[PDB]
Amino acid sequence: ATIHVDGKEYEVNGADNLLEACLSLGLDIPYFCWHPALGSVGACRQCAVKQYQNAEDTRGRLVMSCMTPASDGTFISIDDEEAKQFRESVVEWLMTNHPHDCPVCEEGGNCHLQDMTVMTGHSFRRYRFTKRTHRNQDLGPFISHEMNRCIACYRCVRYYKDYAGGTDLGVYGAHDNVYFGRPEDGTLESEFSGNLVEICPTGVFTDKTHSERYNRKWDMQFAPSICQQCSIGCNISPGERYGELRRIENRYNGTVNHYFLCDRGRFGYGYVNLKDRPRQPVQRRGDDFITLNAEQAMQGAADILRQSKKVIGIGSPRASVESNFALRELVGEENFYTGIAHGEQERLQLALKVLREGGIYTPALREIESYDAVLVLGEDVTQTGARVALAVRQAVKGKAREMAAAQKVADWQIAAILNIGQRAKHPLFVTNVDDTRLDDIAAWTYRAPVEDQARLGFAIAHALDNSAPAVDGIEPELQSKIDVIVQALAGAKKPLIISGTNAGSLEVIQAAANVAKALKGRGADVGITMIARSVNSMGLGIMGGGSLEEALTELETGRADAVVVLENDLHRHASATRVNAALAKAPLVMVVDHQRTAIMENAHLVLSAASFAESDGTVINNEGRAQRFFQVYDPAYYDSKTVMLESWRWLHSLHSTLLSREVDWTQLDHVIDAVVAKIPELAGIKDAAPDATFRIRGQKLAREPHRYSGRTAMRANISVHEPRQPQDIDTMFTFSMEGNNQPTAHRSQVPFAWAPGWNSPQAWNKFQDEVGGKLRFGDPGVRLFETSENGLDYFTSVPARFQPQDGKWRIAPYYHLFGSDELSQRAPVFQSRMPQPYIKLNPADAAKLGVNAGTRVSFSYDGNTVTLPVEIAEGLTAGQVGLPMGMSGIAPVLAGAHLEDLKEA
């Protein structure tokens, strides 16, 4: 299409509306109610331009550019005097009731309303009357509510309801008393409620966790990092100030997590700021804890390692690729053990084999929203991979999108799309041990044990393709529902099969692979998604090694006298008693970690590693994409006695001191090149980010904004002399403003979005080639593996039905978004949000034991009698007992595990 803006010709896409087309060209139109992800509704009337019928037209007409299609040969004007005066009048009308709140408002300096008030040039107030006020609600521990600052742009309700699928937020009231919130005080129920702080263009919804230790946006030090709280790998911008992590903002990745995080990623960063973290290396001498510097800790550790006869290394899926590789190099490939259980490692390896050998394309998180039918097998995605659940909701609304497109309704006119697609939606079939949070939009929900879910998947694969193995013992109504699933999936142009390793069953993953193969054989454009557990689970699976049980037997039999545990608490992957016995038997335990774990009581040496905020590295997400996270701040800048290094730096210097009796604090690119040379399956991680020599016209990339303040006074209480600026030899970023963050810079790693006149999160529009699309010059991250030409075979190992045996109790996993991730549990703000641990029981089983709802029962596993109060779960299958995974004492290795001595306390 061709448009003429202010007499200048432009070539745009005709399917877009005028506002997004003009913002993609760099033109500045003020706007409030439109969002690139939510569509156009034409409420705020801020985006007004003047449209003319032809070139020889002088009068024109004011139109909303967000609601005007960018048709071919469209003549408009933004800088028309009438349009400018109307946009100024809209800003003024918004400003009549706005509170005098900017100094004491957390959105100041990050406010879209401030930016558009300045952009319209409106700075004189001629309104002399009273301003309306509102009471505020309590929205829980995460979101702070300030209703006075609202401009009634309806972004919150549209996002939270039409996009996120939440139910408890809404718009109440009338003419100019419109209220946006919950009907009563209470916590926002959605797992994606945290994106309201970026969706809201004003200070109504604010980050309460940030509002505790508040600082303005110009005062933050930012870095482009990857969220470490599950395997999705959403791009984040951690921002720090005064040596502590202050905020997690969304970082735009048009291929992964474009505008939206989940609440675990956004608010579960509080473990970084804990005061019990290791900040110096500590050596045990009898009962004494001697604090060492880097050099003497490395010398003593390498000497004791040299006197040892066999050193084993226990990695972790929390650690980066470089740190796991450095441990593998230090202890040797044959002595390296992945720090996960044998069943967990088997499920992880099977998921990786399906992803990179099954011949079926695995979509990115953004690409999930374009699929026509979704089958989720055994994976509670809302609690384990939440952004996948959000993308599944978008893919479900794709049917309403297609129905509206059949009636020649444009894709940005969201109200008409929702009107045409009333309740018609794409087929969604979820299977779990109980009800999921996707049940409100699911076409069918199957509450069954993991064997029965696997048998359902194998039956679906057999009915789609008769070459697949059959299932014997299917009930006729279950067969009818299976047939419903089969005709829904076979009629889909782009079916999607989602599973993962959190189900605790190998057969569920095998059944999902069988369904995907059966759909691939029919010619469908099938995609497969596997949800892992931790941030670098796929990286640890690609690296390979032994299981944690093998390392425990190596420690117990005395074949290994030295163990180096990297970023692993060892209690989430094995029993605590056996781990404690093996670590007490081992004469040398060296724990390289950044969190105070329980295994440092018996550890001979504790190396104060860096977390993601204080380190660089690479992580492989659930779809096999290598992503580089960068260090946010130097921990030794404010506390000069802090020796907190990267884990790969610790292990590489330990290897160098073990070999040549000399420390070597290496560079990140050297470890990256070592990974690429030694492990060819991880050769793609070289291209995740450019090396430390990367420059933009000769200068580095800035971590902090141009107006970063207090540089001669933040450390003046320690010493009036300004310290040396921390040098960054590992990466292309600098710990200063002396760098580049231009939106037109040829790069893909963007620490934060800021353009002049756009201080809000809306500056990501300036950082994209087209708004709502990809990052300009490509999104960061590279897929490690391509789709194989030939797939796997059908898995003939069809499990039997779940048999409830007396005495035994099958543990059904119950994951929680706030409580299943270890570091997220360590965050103090999650302690109020996380629920009290309830053991879930069937009504029939609770009647059999005679226990009611709320009474405490005690059960023993691995000789550990623990007590929990009972919650009645009707959707659970009899013979199963539900356990909340990741919680206090309930390790996630209990999925699929049997249970003994379930008795009332």
Residues forming the site for ligand SF4 (CB under 6 A): 98-99, 101-102, 105, 107-108, 111, 113-114, 149-156, 180, 199-204, 227, 229-230, 232-234, 257, 261-262, 264-265, 385-387
Q: Does 64 bind ligand FES (CB under 6 A)?
A: yes
Residue owning tokens 């993601």: 612
Q: Give the sign of the dihedral formed by CA 683, CA 684, CA 685, CA 687.
A: positive
34, 154, 458, 633: which one contacts ligand FES (CB under 6 A)? 34
Using CB positions, name the residue nearest to ligand SF4.
265
146, 322, 614, 730: which one contacts Ca ion (CB under 5 A)? 730
Q: Which of residues 748-767 bind other proteins (CB under 8 A)?
A: 756-757, 759
Q: What are the helix and strand counts (H, E) for the chain?
A: 24, 36
Stretch touching ligand FES by CB under 6 A, among 28-36, 81-89, 197-205, 250-258: 28-36
Q: Does 418 bind other proteins (CB under 8 A)?
A: no
Least separation in angstroms between CB 101 and ligand SF4: 4
Q: Which of residues 202 and 335 has its CB atom nearest to other proteins in the complex?
A: 202
Least separation in angstroms between CB 708 and other proteins: 11
Cβ–Cβ contacts within 10 Å for residue 722, how many? 12
744, 796, 805, 855: which one contacts other proteins (CB under 8 A)? 744
122 binds, among ligand SF4, other proteins, Ca ion, none (CB under 5 to 8 A by kind): other proteins
Least separation in angstroms between CB 302 and Ca ion: 22
Q: Which of 202, 194, 247, 197 is nearest to 220 (CA)?
A: 247
Stretch touching Ca ion by CB under 5 A, among 253-261, 345-353, 517-525, 627-635: 627-635
9, 54, 103, 693: which one contacts other proteins (CB under 8 A)? 103
Q: Which of 329, 331, 276 is nearest to 588 (CA)?
A: 331
Least separation in angstroms between CB 139 and ligand FES: 25
Stretch touching other proteins by CB under 8 A, among 127-135, 322-330, 598-606, 663-671: 127-135
Least separation in angstroms between CB 153 and ligand FES: 7
819-to-149, 442, 788, 884 alpha-carbon distances in Å? 33, 25, 37, 9
Least separation in angstroms between CB 28 and other proteins: 10
Query: What are 753's two structure tokens?
Result: 């979005």
Q: Does 410 bind ligand FES (CB under 6 A)?
A: no
Q: 3: buried, middle or exposed (CB in 10 Å: 19+, 13-18, 0-12)?
A: buried
Q: Does 234 bind ligand FES (CB under 6 A)?
A: no
Q: 403: buried, middle or exposed (CB in 10 Å: 19+, 13-18, 0-12)?
A: middle
Q: Which of residues 128 and 408 has its CB atom nearest to other proteins in the complex?
A: 128
Measured distance CA(754)–CA(217) in Å, rounded: 10
How many Cα atoms sit within 13 Å of 512 on the Cβ side?
Answer: 36
Measured distance CA(210)–CA(247) in Å, rounded: 6
Stretch touching ligand FES by CB under 6 A, among 39-47, 54-62, 131-139, 752-760: 39-47
128 binds, among ligand SF4, other proteins, ligand FES, none (CB under 5 to 8 A by kind): other proteins
229 binds, among ligand SF4, other proteins, ligand FES, none (CB under 5 to 8 A by kind): ligand SF4
Categorise residue 28: left if φ over 0, alpha if ψ from -120 to 50, beta otherwise: beta
Q: Which of residues 631 and 760 has its CB atom nearest to Ca ion in the complex?
A: 631
Q: Does 163 bind ligand FES (CB under 6 A)?
A: no
730 binds, among ligand SF4, ligand FES, Ca ion, none (CB under 5 to 8 A by kind): Ca ion
Q: Does 634 bind Ca ion (CB under 5 A)?
A: no
230 binds, among other proteins, ligand SF4, Ca ion, none (CB under 5 to 8 A by kind): ligand SF4
Measured distance CA(476)–CA(652) in Å, rounded: 61
Q: Does 416 bind other proteins (CB under 8 A)?
A: no
Q: Does 199 bind ligand FES (CB under 6 A)?
A: no
DSSP notation for 260-275 = ---HHHHHTTGGGG-T
Query: What are 165's two structure tokens?
Result: 């699928």
Stretch touching other proteins by CB under 8 A, among 81-89, 137-145, 234-242, 450-458: 81-89
Q: Does 522 bind other proteins (CB under 8 A)?
A: no
- The three-state secondary structure class of 209 is helix
Cβ–Cβ contacts within 10 Å for residue 130, how many? 8
Least separation in angstroms between CB 38 and ligand FES: 11
Measured distance CA(404)–CA(411) in Å, rounded: 8
Stretch touching other proteins by CB under 8 A, among 37-45, 270-278, 345-353, 882-890: 37-45
Pairing of strands 288-291, 527-531: unpaired
Q: Which of residues 369 and 614 has its CB atom nearest to Ca ion in the complex?
A: 614
Q: Does 353 bind other proteins (CB under 8 A)?
A: no
504 binds, among ligand SF4, Ca ion, other proteins, none (CB under 5 to 8 A by kind): none
Stretch touching ligand FES by CB under 6 A, among 25-33, 259-267, 334-342, 820-828: 25-33
Q: Which of residues 714-743 bind other proteins (CB under 8 A)?
A: 724-725, 736, 738, 740, 742
Residue owning tokens 């781990």: 579
Residues in the chain, total: 905
Q: Does 521 bind ligand FES (CB under 6 A)?
A: no
Q: Does 45 bind ligand FES (CB under 6 A)?
A: yes
Categorise residue 552: left if φ over 0, alpha if ψ from -120 to 50, beta otherwise: alpha
Q: Which amino acid is at 618?
A: T
* 480 contact partners, CB below 8 Å, separation of at least 6: none
The answer to whether 77 and 55 are in contact (CB under 8 A) is no
* 892 contact partners, CB below 8 Å, separation of at least 6: 502, 533, 572, 573, 813, 820, 885, 886
Q: Does 44 bind other proteins (CB under 8 A)?
A: yes
Q: What does R_g of the chain's alpha carbons equal in angstroms?
A: 28
* 103 contact partners, CB below 8 Å, separation of at least 6: none
Q: Which of 316, 278, 288, 309 is nearest to 604 (CA)?
A: 288
Query: What are 782's two structure tokens?
Result: 């590279």
The answer to whether 462 and 485 are in contact (CB under 8 A) is no
Q: Which of residues 64 and 314 has its CB atom nearest to other proteins in the complex?
A: 64
The answer to whether 483 and 536 are in contact (CB under 8 A) is no
* 900 contact partners, CB below 8 Å, separation of at least 6: 807, 808, 809, 859, 860, 861
Q: Which of residues 142 and 612 has its CB atom nearest to Ca ion in the complex?
A: 612
Measured distance CA(339)–CA(316) in Å, rounded: 5
Q: How many residues bind ligand FES (CB under 6 A)?
A: 13
122-to-28, 118, 855 alpha-carbon distances in Å? 16, 6, 63
Pairing of strands 562-566, 588-593: parallel
Q: Does 614 bind Ca ion (CB under 5 A)?
A: no
Least separation in angstroms between CB 44 and ligand FES: 4
Least separation in angstroms between CB 98 and ligand SF4: 6
31, 260, 802, 861: which one contacts ligand FES (CB under 6 A)? 31
Q: Which of residues 97 and 323 has its CB atom nearest to other proteins in the complex?
A: 97
Q: How many residues bind other proteins (CB under 8 A)?
A: 69
Q: Does 43 bind ligand FES (CB under 6 A)?
A: yes
Cβ–Cβ contacts within 10 Å for residue 109, how many? 20
Q: Which of 580, 586, 579 is nearest to 557 (CA)?
A: 586
Sites of contact with ligand FES (CB under 6 A): 19, 31-34, 42-47, 64, 66
Sites of contact with other proteins (CB under 8 A): 42-46, 48, 61-63, 85-86, 89-90, 92-103, 108-109, 113-115, 117-118, 121-130, 151-152, 154, 173-178, 216, 218, 695, 697-699, 706-707, 724-725, 736, 738, 740, 742, 744, 756-757, 759
